[PDB]
């Protein structure tokens, strides 16, 4: 019942990094589609 690998992978600091990287990836995917002008 102690899921050490998943608790380590989903640690709050790593979750914060994944949020930041998802923000940057979504912003740079939008910037690249809305440049169709």
């Amino acid at each position: 019942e102690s899921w050490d690998f998943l608790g380590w992978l989903l640690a709050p600091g790593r979750l914060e990094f994944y949020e930041k990287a998802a923000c940057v990836a979504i912003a740079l995917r939008v910037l690249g589609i809305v440049i169709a002008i």
């Binding site: 102690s2 050490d4 690998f5 380590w8 992978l9 709050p12 790593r14 990094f17 990287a21 940057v24 990836a25 740079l28 910037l31 690249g32 440049i35």
Partner: protein, 391 residues
């Protein structure tokens, strides 16, 4: 980010593409950062999991490091601990609770709004005056009239409280105003806690007794410093215990090998190490064969708990079981008598003698001795009743 424009980046066709596409340049930068972090994640996972293959425990103590006492289970055991003494449990917990009440911000927003109210005494948004007008007479009896009078003296008693003690934030009884707020960042609150001595209660704060720096006096370096050092050692030992519990929760060997206690001795082979790393990987950690089968453990324990005699006790002349000495309305109706109990006998007798101590409005601090809780409250009531005859 404006980079990849000079001659120093001439030669790669994809870089030649990224010259005129800033979105490609930004995609490259973000992707390189993400790839580097993924490499960090892979390496950290390897560095976490590969030492688990190298851990081997002692086969005699099964990785415990302590064995059951040879005698008595004493001068061969360990030296107990601080918390085995049952007589000091309530005092230790009372001092710990008094220390934790400094840090406790469970009533945080309530004390913050009280602090704002006592800071700006110009509030508004009342919108209806409470009626709340019935302290009827100093006459009649019962419980309702007494509780209602004690509830109606709330304003004057609160004024007395705010005059004698004031706000906890204005006297540093609590942590103060907004210093540790969640949702800000783990690290801004760490900075605010490291600011002055916010991690210590004022009973151990160094900036409270430095004014007594001449000649020592009340032992600001021998009593307050000793108390602060003991408190820090206790919280560090709590962190060690939590790390040991975390390692025990995932079946891993414990990192901190604690000394043997009053029922245990050190292992014969380890001496207390109980496990260690080695060059040779563990073939039980690998292949999943680390824990024994339940039926095998049951068979081992049954055979160990049920010794058999293969000699009839008539040919061998044995008439007694193994051991020394050999020849030889209580405990069968009610069953035994408590042994750890007995220090609470006086408090139980006083609670039976005075049923008013069972009042729901009364909350004593707690304790068993003459000093603390029920006996302290009874002595205070008796002293008040004796001194009201002289006044």
């Amino acid at each position: 980010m404006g980079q990849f424009y000079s001659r120093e980046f001439d030669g790669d066709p994809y870089v030649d593409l990224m010259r005129s596409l800033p979105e490609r340049e930004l995609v490259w930068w973000a992707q390189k950062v993400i790839w580097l972090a993924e490499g960090f994640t892979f390496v950290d996972h390897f560095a976490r999991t590969y030492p688990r293959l190298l851990q081997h425990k002692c086969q005699r103590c099964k990785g415990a490091g302590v064995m059951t006492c040879p005698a008595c289970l004493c001068r061969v055991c360990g030296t107990a601990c601080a918390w085995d003494a049952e007589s000091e449990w309530m005092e230790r917990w009372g001092e710990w609770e008094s220390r934790l009440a400094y840090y406790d911000k469970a009533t945080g927003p309530l004390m913050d709004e009280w602090y704002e109210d006592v800071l700006n005494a110009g509030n508004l948004e009342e919108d209806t005056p409470p009626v709340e007008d019935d302290p009827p007479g100093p006459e009649v009896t019962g419980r309702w009239a007494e509780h209602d009078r004690a509830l109606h003296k709330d304003k004057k008693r609160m004024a007395a409280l705010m005059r004698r003690w004031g706000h906890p934030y204005d006297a540093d009884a609590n942590l103060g105003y907004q210093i540790v707020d969640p949702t800000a960042s783990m690290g801004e609150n760490v900075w605010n806690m490291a600011q002055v001595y916010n991690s210590l209660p004022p009973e151990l704060n160094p900036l409270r007794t430095q004014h007594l720096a001449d000649r020592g006096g009340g032992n600001t370096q021998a009593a307050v410093e000793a108390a602060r050092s003991a408190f820090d050692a206790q919280v560090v030992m709590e962190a060690a215990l939590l790390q040991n519990l975390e390692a025990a929760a995932q079946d891993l060997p414990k990192p901190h090998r604690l000394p043997p206690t009053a029922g245990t001795v050190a292992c014969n082979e380890c001496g207390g190490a109980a496990w260690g790393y080695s060059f040779f990987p563990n073939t039980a950690v690998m292949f999943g064969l680390e824990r024994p089968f339940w039926g095998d453990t049951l068979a081992r324990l049954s055979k160990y708990w049920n010794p058999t005699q293969v000699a009839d006790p008539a040919r061998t002349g044995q008439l007694l079981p193994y051991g020394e000495g050999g020849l030889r309305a209580l405990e069968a109706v009610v069953g035994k008598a408590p042994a750890t109990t007995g220090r609470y006998r006086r408090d139980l007798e006083l609670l039976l003698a005075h049923p008013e101590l069972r009042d729901g409005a009364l909350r004593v601090p707690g304790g068993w001795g003459p000093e603390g809780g029920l006996q302290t409250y009874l002595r205070g009531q008796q002293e008040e009743q004796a001194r009201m005859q002289r006044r």
